[PDB]
Write a protein that binds this ligand. Structure first.
Ligand code: FCJ
Ligand code: MG
Ligand code: NA
Ligand code: NA
Ligand code: NA
Length: 326
DNA sequence: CCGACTGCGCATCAGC
DNA sequence: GCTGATGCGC
DNA sequence: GTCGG
């Protein structure tokens, strides 16, 4: 694709800033620049040309000039050579290990995949499962497997109660040919912004999926959010499917459209859209869109009857899920 | 120049 | 136990 | 690291 070279460079820089420097703004600055260049329908021929795009300022422009001229970036080359940065970067690849825990571990001389396995008593539960499935979680999910997964989740949900609606979101809903994980939006008429007239609404669904050996592990769980591990059943003599990440979000039914907009993403699209909302004087989360008052406080939830209504409020033309892959 | 940068659930820890 | 802050991941 | 005001 693209300016793949340049966007990979920026991504690597973002990851460095987040994992090593713990500089979260530089990290989102890089991700924004990577995103806007990924979308740019021209092979970038100079940093000057790139600087025209929003989110590419002077520093990134100079970096792009270097990369175009030499095929690489000295800054990254040093970072790759530095033992400590490389170690921290690697450890953050385990789910549940972030920049802080990674640096904690490196400080203790825990630097490798083997070190982690040898020190499992030093891991919290999430981290333990992330280590367990380190390999599998590196693998993307072909859309073909995503479709099989959807059929299982939806049918099992129906069996618990026919009034549940489960909607697969994330990259899948945007039409991707492969997904990093499975994002499931859940609603039930007993759970609204006005009342929860049934307890355990999410629990029952997770229970069912455990019962049929679809959900294999739990990373975290509460009343509206489940995050864990699942696996497709395999056939006689067939190798097993990799284990896969799964998140289920229970959203009040009268807030479906905000919820499905959030969970459909992408993450950077959501950020771009929420930023723009602020510029139009609204705030958007996965529940509501509310006006901001002069005082700087969110007012009362606006009526929403579609995804498009949310776009309409902030004066954006509607964009289909497939065109939100920023 | 420089304040502002999207928003939030769950796990964990600190302090009481 | 609680509250509030931080870590981590969507 | 970038940028609107
Ligand atoms: N930081 C964030 N801020 C706002 N919204 C966010 C954020 N992270 C996430 N989201 C929303 C959008 C995303 O599609 C959805 C699922 O989160 P995921 O992290 O699964 O994103 P994906 O778009 O599913 C790519 P994949 O194929 O690698 O899985 O959750
Ligand atoms: Mg996903
Ligand atoms: Na720019
Ligand atoms: Na991680
Ligand atoms: Na997910």
């Amino acid at each position: 694709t693209l300016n793949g070279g340049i966007t990979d460079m920026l991504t690597e820089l973002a990851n460095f800033e987040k994992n090593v420097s713990q500089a979260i703004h530089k990290y989102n600055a890089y991700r924004k620049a990577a995103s806007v260049i990924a979308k740019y329908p021209h092979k970038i021929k100079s940093g000057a040309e790139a600087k025209k795009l929003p989110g590419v300022g002077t520093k990134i422009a100079e970096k792009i000039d270097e990369f175009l001229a030499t095929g690489k970036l000295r800054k990254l080359e040093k970072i790759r050579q530095d033992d400590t940065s490389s170690s921290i970067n690697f450890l953050t690849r385990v789910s549940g290990i972030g920049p802080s825990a990674a640096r904690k571990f490196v400080d203790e001389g825990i630097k490798t995949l083997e070190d982690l396995r040898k020190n499992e008593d030093k891991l919290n539960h999430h981290q333990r499962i992330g280590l367990k499935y380190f390999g599998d979680f590196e693998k993307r999910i072909p859309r073909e497997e995503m479709l099989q997964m959807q059929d299982i989740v939806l049918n099992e949900v129906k069996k618990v109660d026919s009034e549940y609606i489960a909607t697969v979101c994330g990259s899948f809903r945007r039409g991707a040919e492969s997904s990093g994980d499975m994002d499931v939006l859940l609603t039930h008429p007993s759970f609204t912004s006005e009342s929860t007239k049934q307890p355990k609404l999410l629990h029952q669904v997770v229970e069912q999926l455990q019962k049929v050996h679809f959900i294999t592990d739990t990373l975290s769980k509460g009343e509206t959010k489940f995050m864990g591990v699942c696996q497709l059943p395999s056939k006689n003599d067939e190798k097993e499917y990799p284990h896969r990440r799964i998140d289920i979000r229970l959203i009040p039914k009268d807030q479906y459209y905000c919820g499905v907009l959030y969970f459909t993403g992408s993450d950077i699209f959501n950020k771009n859209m929420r930023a723009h909302a602020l510029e139009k004087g609204f705030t958007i989360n996965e529940y509501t869109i509310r006006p901001l008052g002069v005082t700087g406080v969110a007012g009362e939830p606006l009526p929403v009857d579609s995804e498009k209504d949310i776009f309409d409020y902030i004066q954006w033309k509607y964009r289909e899920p497939k065109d939100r892959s920023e």
